[PDB]
Design a protein around this ligand. Structure first.
Ligand SMILES: [Mg+2]
Ligand SMILES: [Mg+2]
Ligand SMILES: [Mg+2]
Ligand SMILES: [Mg+2]
Ligand SMILES: [Mg+2]
Ligand SMILES: [Mg+2]
Ligand SMILES: [Mg+2]
Ligand SMILES: [Mg+2]
Ligand SMILES: [Mg+2]
Ligand SMILES: [Mg+2]
Ligand SMILES: [Mg+2]
Ligand SMILES: [Mg+2]
Ligand SMILES: [Mg+2]
Ligand SMILES: [Mg+2]
Ligand SMILES: [Mg+2]
Ligand SMILES: [Mg+2]
Ligand SMILES: [Mg+2]
Ligand SMILES: [Mg+2]
Ligand SMILES: [Mg+2]
Ligand SMILES: [Mg+2]
Ligand SMILES: [Mg+2]
Ligand SMILES: [Mg+2]
Ligand SMILES: [Mg+2]
Ligand SMILES: [Mg+2]
Lengths: 155, 184, 145
RNA sequence: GCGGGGAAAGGAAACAUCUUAGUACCCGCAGGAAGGGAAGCCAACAGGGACCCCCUGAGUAGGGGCGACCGAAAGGGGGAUAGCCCAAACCAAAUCCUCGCGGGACAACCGUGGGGAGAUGUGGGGCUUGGGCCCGGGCAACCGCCGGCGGGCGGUAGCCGAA
RNA sequence: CUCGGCUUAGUUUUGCCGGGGGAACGCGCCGGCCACUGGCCGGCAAGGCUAAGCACGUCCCGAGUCCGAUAGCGCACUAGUA
RNA sequence: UCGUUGCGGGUCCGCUUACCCGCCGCAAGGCGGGGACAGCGGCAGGCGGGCUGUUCGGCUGGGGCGGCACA
RNA sequence: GGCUGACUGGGCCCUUGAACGCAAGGGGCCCAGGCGGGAAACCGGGGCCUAGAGAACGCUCGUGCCCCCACCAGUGGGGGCC
């Protein structure tokens, strides 16, 4: 069994000091250097590596060491490497006309903000909710019905 | 410090005064030439090379001239609420650079647009240089950058076999060199 | 450090703005030949990027700049850089002819002599003529290095 | 699916800001999906770690004749998982395309010759675990190109099937 | 940075287009919900690509507390036909 | 008013290459005139039913005029 | 003749609004603080009594050793409660 990295959930001010753990994106470089591997060797063996992470957790190190011994003692089969195994790049037609050049990206706002906060994203997202009658769009004016109902009953 | 660094100083503050004298004489011919014209070399070589220009067969640099200002917003001829009747100050969400790219794309049908950059401004016109590439040319298809626009494919057997072969040899080496340290 | 607004204040007739003084055909043809002799015996450089690095590093002895670069800003920085480092230079009418004397199949906008093997005497005499031309044009002298 | 242009009716128990709605509709451009995607990020001194989509956060923050109404994001749980290049520093034509011929699984590629691109820089190198530069040691070097030969499996007709 | 405009929850604080002005360079630059100052923290814009996992139904296969010829698609039929 | 808007001379004078206007020429370019004005873009004030959207309350010996018996 | 109670902070009740929901405004009886008139009692929270009266948003003013403004502190500025 491949081990899964264990990272800390970011402790917010709202939390008040309550903390929990979660499956991180991948094993940090500091955790890998305590077992003798770099990112290329770890990904070749099949581990998920996160070079962005700086912290090191001993529980992550022990799980690496126990699993690495089984692999190097022929008692475990490693998974396929965590590297790209296919290269599919399609020919692009009408990049200028679909706003995919640098000027189009700047006009869409992808240079200055995230895709989720761009305006074209907000238009498409609210349209999908209204088309499917999703979470808050299943009722129009849900906030005002809720507000007046709270006054009348909690008077 | 490459020569391209010194080339940019004509568009910096140190060389702006001399460059505007040059543009006042160069712009006379450009205003008389066609609106879209192919050029042998880019006007801003250092800027062009950053955006992906190379002097390879099939790469086209076109100079585009267009009128500045807001777009030709049309006054509605039917009933509208007062918010929707204004004209002055209303502009398009497209910039003139993207507009200049699209016009250059029309004149060279089938060529893909790579990038474009600003060149010069005058009282009426704005000038851009659009880099278009022929995706059907053999010298463009194999370019490390130009294959991002012209498409690229690698069989899964090629990547999967070598990655498998790398993992077999890495495990062989790690057993003899890393296993004693891990167990100890 | 030299302001281009002063170094390029008074351009010559029928020439790009980076040309500071007129070069006669016999001095221009001579400077072409020394580049051929320097390439054949000593050491030279061709190309704007390579010649610019030589002027920065101080290994340049003569810099040849063509007058027929189509976008002149490709080589317009070279005279200011040469005057900065006190390297003598001269203009040549054709970049196609400069590339031939440099030994390349394409035009060269600029070239520099690093080591003039059998043209050491001719290079010194050439600088004197170009230096005499510079004095006539209100320019200070740039001596042989 | 992507980019641009872009209403009104109706609602607000009138109506102009507003909403309807960046909708209907129009113009342009792609794919079998598209677009997005690899930190000039989020956080708060504790840490996450590209992207998209689903559940939630949440009708909360906030916007608004603070009216009608509109309305996130971070974070958490999942599906899936993958990282790389161009330019520049440094070297300077060591480069690439095409065709003829000889060879070479009908390929790539090798030799030879003509032509074209290329010093306004082809190519090498470099890609946050920054790099270039200088020095020393080691290969489990690394990175790319072709898809021939063999095998297996599935689809595009069918066949056998008890009393 | 400033002015006009469209847009956005973005509010002295979203994004963008247009007019005018307009940097610096790794000893630098950018962000931390008004601006500036100091500290601290996080990063390196203005260049390009990227499988998987997600939308759809001309079409194909299966299912149905669906309809049953004034129903069900306009069309069970020489129906987008006369 | 900001930009286009430049070159000389002492805010004013001049100049032409910008720009504009006409003539000739396929074009290349030439001729004449105006001229950094004009025209054009942005912003700002004025006139602006030329055009767009709307509002033109209620009670009431029917409606309207009146009155407010509308607080 | 002497003064400013046309007072500061609060509560309860009546009427507008019958029995019977429901603004603003108005009136009454008081508690505390500090005053004026008077020997004292007592009275004074405008006019002898019943009329002269105005929500939300916004702005402004007064008030508090007052609260908040996004990692921390400071300056300017902004917001909040009465
Ligand atoms: Mg909603
Ligand atoms: Mg309407
Ligand atoms: Mg409707
Ligand atoms: Mg209405
Ligand atoms: Mg109506
Ligand atoms: Mg088509
Ligand atoms: Mg896709
Ligand atoms: Mg794609
Ligand atoms: Mg909306
Ligand atoms: Mg190169
Ligand atoms: Mg049978
Ligand atoms: Mg029947
Ligand atoms: Mg029928
Ligand atoms: Mg004028
Ligand atoms: Mg005007
Ligand atoms: Mg009217
Ligand atoms: Mg009215
Ligand atoms: Mg009536
Ligand atoms: Mg009346
Ligand atoms: Mg009443
Ligand atoms: Mg009652
Ligand atoms: Mg009275
Ligand atoms: Mg009253
Ligand atoms: Mg914060």
């Amino acid at each position: 069994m491949i081990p899964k990295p264990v990272v800390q959930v970011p402790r917010s001010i709202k939390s008040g000091g309550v903390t929990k753990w979660k499956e991180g994106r991948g094993f940090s470089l500091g955790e890998l250097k305590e077992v003798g591997l770099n990112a290329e060797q770890a990904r070749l063996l099949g581990l998920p590596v996160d070079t962005r992470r700086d912290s090191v957790w001993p529980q992550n190190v022990e799980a690496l060491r126990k699993w690495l011994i089984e692999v190097l003692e022929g008692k475990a089969t490693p998974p396929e490497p965590t590297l790209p195994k296919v290269v599919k790049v399609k020919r692009k037609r009408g990049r200028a006309f679909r706003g995919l050049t640098s000027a189009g990206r700047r006009s869409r706002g992808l240079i200055s903000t995230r895709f989720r906060e761009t305006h074209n994203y907000k238009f498409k997202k609210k349209a999908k909710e209204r088309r499917l009658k999703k979470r808050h769009e299943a009722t129009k004016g849900l906030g005002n019905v809720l507000r007046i109902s709270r006054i009348i009953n909690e008077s | 410090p490459s020569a391209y660094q010194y080339m940019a100083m004509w568009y910096r503050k140190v060389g702006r005064e001399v460059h505007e004298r040059l543009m006042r004489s160069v712009l006379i011919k450009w205003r008389k030439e066609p609106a879209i014209v192919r050029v042998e070399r880019p006007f801003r070589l250092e800027r062009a090379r950053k955006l992906g220009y190379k002097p390879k067969q099939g790469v086209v640099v076109a100079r585009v001239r267009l009128i500045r200002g807001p777009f030709n917003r049309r006054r509605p001829d039917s009933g509208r609420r007062p918010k929707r009747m204004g004209v002055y100050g209303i502009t398009a969400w497209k910039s003139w650079r993207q507009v200049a790219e699209e016009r250059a794309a029309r004149k060279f049908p089938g060529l893909e647009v790579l990038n474009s950059y600003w060149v010069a401004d005058d009282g009426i016109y704005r000038y851009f240089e659009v880099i278009l590439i022929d995706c059907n040319q053999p010298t463009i298809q194999r370019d490390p950058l130009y294959s991002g626009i012209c498409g690229r494919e690698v069989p899964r057997r090629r990547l999967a076999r070598r990655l498998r072969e790398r993992q077999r040899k890495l495990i062989e080496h790690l057993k003899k060199t890393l296993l004693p340290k891990l167990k100890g | 450090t030299i302001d281009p607004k002063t170094f390029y204040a008074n351009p010559l007739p029928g020439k790009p703005f980076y040309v500071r003084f007129e070069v006669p055909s016999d001095v221009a043809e001579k400077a072409l030949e020394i580049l051929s002799i320097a390439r054949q015996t000593g050491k030279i450089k061709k190309g704007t990027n390579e010649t610019t690095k030589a002027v920065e590093r101080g290994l340049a002895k003569l810099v040849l700049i063509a007058e027929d670069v189509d976008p002149p800003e490709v080589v317009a920085h070279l005279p200011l850089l040469c005057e900065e480092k006190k390297v003598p230079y001269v203009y040549v009418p054709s970049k196609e002819k400069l590339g031939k004397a440099a030994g390349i199949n394409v035009a060269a906008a600029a070239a520099v002599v690093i080591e003039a093997g059998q043209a050491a005497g001719e290079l010194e005499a050439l600088v004197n003529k170009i230096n005499e031309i510079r004095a006539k044009h209100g320019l200070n002298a740039i001596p042989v290095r």
